[PDB]
Design a protein around this ligand. Structure first.
Ligand SMILES: COc1cc2nc(N(C)C3CCCC3)nc(NC3CCN(C)CC3)c2cc1OC
Ligand SMILES: COc1cc2nc(N(C)C3CCCC3)nc(NC3CCN(C)CC3)c2cc1OC
Ligand SMILES: C[S@@+](CC[C@H](N)C(=O)[O-])C[C@H]1O[C@@H](n2cnc3c(N)ncnc32)[C@H](O)[C@@H]1O
Ligand SMILES: C[S@@+](CC[C@H](N)C(=O)[O-])C[C@H]1O[C@@H](n2cnc3c(N)ncnc32)[C@H](O)[C@@H]1O
Ligand SMILES: [Zn+2]
Ligand SMILES: [Zn+2]
Ligand SMILES: [Zn+2]
Ligand SMILES: [Zn+2]
Ligand SMILES: [Zn+2]
Ligand SMILES: [Zn+2]
Ligand SMILES: [Zn+2]
Ligand SMILES: [Zn+2]
Lengths: 261, 258
């Protein structure tokens, strides 16, 4: 029988509820972490938030023209009228996306704003049979759709070096020697429950919104293909995760092309 | 005739538009500033945002009980179900309000969340006859209602000391800070001074509890009728400086700066 153990793990902080169900075992809704809908810090990170350091656009339309300066930073704006990534988007090597911000001349409803509008897809935390908790989609998700952000505690590489629990770490970009991490172990959103898959239906894209401090991209998962209702979400944790954890367990994604089994 | 010179000075950043009209003269919609709906910085302020430094509540209900820690930090929760201040709230000497935050156990719809939900009232920027631009309410606003936040650039006292234009400054009163709405601000930068004001500023804490940096929330002190101009008391530092240049035109029979 399928137990509903929470109607919303996000406690109303997202646009839609994220329920938790368990049809497998006795386990209650996870509670050894704090759900947060946006990134937080403990020790200060000193993100550059000087408003005069933002690059911005001067568009007189909805930022759908060839001349949007913010699209230009992104190579071009990659969003169509439905907020979905263009078919030409390179899922194997995604560019950095610069969404419009509060310094731009455009309106808050312009085309070049997707991740900043928050989670929209109907997701569900559920108990898998042999990979603990996982996240599934409750709807069909068309290709190129923003699904969720990898949200957690922003930490330095030196702090990650002394964090014993590293199963919920996302490495950010090396910028002029400085590297940072998102640790979702103690504070995180729904993304902390997404399991690894070697042929993933999500790809992480680095996105800039309210600030443009290149040390601190935000990590937005977009669908790489049509995700069918009921499907488990997955992304590729990458080679550092498996170089460390492969000596403890092998991958159970079940792909016929699994690279970590 | 009243011309509409902007359908929305906020460019969609507020929940409703804030149009600008001018029935007095030929002046276009003000454009020598950047509208921002939330506070910004230029030089860094180093607000303490360590999440483990937040005090928070462990309520299992809607935070309407006396055991809510956030209500206790506020002395009591001052909000009714409708988000309005209780009649016992001291408008003459307001306490600090600590709203619930993302470290609390409660849900995002609990009782102790009002200012963090943002501006809701239908406001309008308009040309007054003798005080430049002002802001009016287009609807009735019951007493104790959150109207708008004083939003701008957060600056140090040292930086305020070297700013030529001080007509859009709100003091966050040794180490003290200021909100300068001259270059970046929201609708509140256009609210004129009134000696018997229908708005009172209240210091509020939401996502952080760094006491150097209260956020300034204007609540109505009485029923504000549709069409009425908004006003708050700029205070004695403003008038000690500006009174040698001009006198108050609020027109109150109890005006203290005429
Ligand atoms: C994506 O997945 C991972 C990323 C990890 N990333 C790091 N760092 C230090 C970042 C910091 C910048 C460059 C690399 N460390 C891990 N583990 C260290 C191992 C030694 N212990 C004592 C501390 C934790 C990781 C483990 C990951 O998954 C198992
Ligand atoms: C609420 O209204 C006001 C508040 C003002 N606040 C300040 N400071 C410096 C804060 C910082 C420490 C305490 C107070 N200065 C003003 N003006 C100084 C005058 C000399 N110039 C060269 C720099 C600006 C102000 C003017 C205000 O209204 C006209
Ligand atoms: C970020 S968590 C994912 C959520 C996790 N299932 C849970 O219940 O908290 C990462 C951990 O989930 C398990 N996991 C995720 N993907 C896996 C995979 N493809 N194969 C085996 N274990 C996996 C491993 O224990 C891994 O260290
Ligand atoms: C923050 S601004 C208010 C918006 C201003 N009316 C405008 O057009 O930008 C403050 C300035 O408005 C004028 N003002 C505001 N209240 C006033 C009052 N009660 N009497 C006379 N002038 C006032 C003064 O020029 C004052 O320095
Ligand atoms: Zn643009
Ligand atoms: Zn832009
Ligand atoms: Zn835009
Ligand atoms: Zn695999
Ligand atoms: Zn509470
Ligand atoms: Zn609380
Ligand atoms: Zn609460
Ligand atoms: Zn007066």
């Amino acid at each position: 029988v399928e137990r509903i153990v929470s109607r919303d793990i996000a406690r109303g902080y997202e646009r839609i509820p994220i329920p938790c169900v368990n049809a497998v075992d006795s386990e209650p809704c996870p509670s050894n972490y704090k759900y947060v809908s946006q990134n937080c810090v403990t020790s200060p990170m000193n993100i550059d938030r000087n408003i005069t350091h933002l690059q911005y656009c001067v568009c007189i339309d909805d930022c759908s023209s060839s001349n949007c300066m913010c699209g230009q930073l992104s190579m071009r704006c990659w969003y169509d009228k439905d907020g979905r990534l263009l078919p030409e988007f390179n899922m194997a090597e995604p560019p950095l996306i610069f969404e419009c911000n509060h310094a731009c001349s455009c309106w808050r409803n312009c085309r070049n704003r997707v991740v900043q509008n928050g989670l929209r897809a109907r997701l569900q935390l559920y108990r898998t049979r042999d990979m603990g908790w996982g996240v599934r989609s409750l709807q069909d998700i068309p290709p190129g759709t923003f699904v969720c952000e990898y949200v957690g505690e922003l930490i330095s590489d030196s702090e990650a070096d002394v964090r014993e629990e590293d199963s919920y770490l996302f490495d950010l970009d090396n910028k002029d020697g400085e590297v940072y991490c998102i640790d979702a172990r103690f504070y995180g959103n729904v993304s902390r429950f997404i399991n690894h898959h070697c042929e993933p239906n999500l790809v992480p894209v680095r996105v800039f919104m309210a600030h443009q401090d290149l040390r601190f991209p935000r990590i937005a998962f977009f669908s790489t293909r049509l995700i069918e209702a009921g499907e488990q979400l997955g992304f590729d944790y990458g080679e550092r995760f498996w170089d460390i954890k492969g000596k403890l367990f092998s991958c159970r994604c079940g792909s016929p092309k699994c690279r970590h089994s």
